[PDB]
């Protein structure tokens, strides 16, 4: 049985929630990841840093689908991220699909995750999550959104941002390249350029993981016969697809 029914994250004299700051520091040391919003789609991406040339990078997904039109990515402690995607995926059903018969909108799911992340601050016997997530998604009534979530459970919507290692440099880069007229193709291109400075090693479709929330892909639905279901808006790129845009770059 548990014994730590008390908060492990508490206010200090200065007003700091120590452990949250420390979790943020873990995210600083995380591999650079970022998101960019366009007029007709959102894109997220990160560097697949590998811990061994014998590991098969394909097996590990840093970019993951939460719902058919929402996708996530992170910087920080992977395992904490992994369990967050499992919990996030489920809540999207328990707290929404299973009662409104539709996926939740982007902002609401981000809330369900902030909610989880919040409770790890305040609750008995636990440390805060050691990750910052970027969530990209589209719903019918708000359009394409881009949200960030920190260990505190705070979330801010962005036009574009980057988190992790080279974050101040990248947001610097992004802050001068972005504008309200971007087309997905252009934002994909910028994301790849921002990520070039954040990588020392090889830079290609196998060392990069990049996904988008854009048009609906019937070729990805799995069935036909239902005219009101067009496929998911989440589409992950292949090594190939990336490299076509690297020659161009």
């Amino acid at each position: 049985t548990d014994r730590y029914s008390f908060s492990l994250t508490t206010f200090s004299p200065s007003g700091k929630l120590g452990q949250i700051d420390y979790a943020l520091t873990a995210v600083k040391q995380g591999v650079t990841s970022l998101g960019i919003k366009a007029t007709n789609g959102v894109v997220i991406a990160t560097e697949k840093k590998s811990s061994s040339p014998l590991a098969m990078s394909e097996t590990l997904s840093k970019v993951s689908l939460l719902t058919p039109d929402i996708g996530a990515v992170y910087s920080g402690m992977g395992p904490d991220y992994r369990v967050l995607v499992d919990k996030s995926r489920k809540v999207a059903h328990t707290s929404y699909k299973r009662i409104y018969g539709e996926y939740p909108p982007t902002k609401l799911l981000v809330s369900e995750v902030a909610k989880i992340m919040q409770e790890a601050t305040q609750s008995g016997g636990v440390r805060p999550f050691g990750v910052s997530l970027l969530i990209a998604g589209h719903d019918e009534f708000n359009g394409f959104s881009l949200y960030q979530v920190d260990p505190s459970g705070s979330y801010f919507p962005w036009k574009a941002t980057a988190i992790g290692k080279g974050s101040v440099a990248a947001k610097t880069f992004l802050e001068k390249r972005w504008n309200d007229e971007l087309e997905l193709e252009d934002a994909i291109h910028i994301a790849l350029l921002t990520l070039k400075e954040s990588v020392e090693g090889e830079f290609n479709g196998d060392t990069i993981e990049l996904a988008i929330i854009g048009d609906e892909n019937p070729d990805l639905l799995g069935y036909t016969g239902i005219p009101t279901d067009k496929g998911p808006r989440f589409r992950k790129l292949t090594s190939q697809e990336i490299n076509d845009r690297l020659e161009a770059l």
């Binding site: 639905l221 799995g222 069935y223 036909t224 016969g225 239902i226």
Partner: peptide, 14 residues
């Protein structure tokens, strides 16, 4: 009718 062929996508013919 719904048709599920091993290679292909499932075709729900309402």
């Amino acid at each position: 009718v719904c048709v599920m062929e091993i290679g292909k996508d499932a075709e729900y013919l309402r």
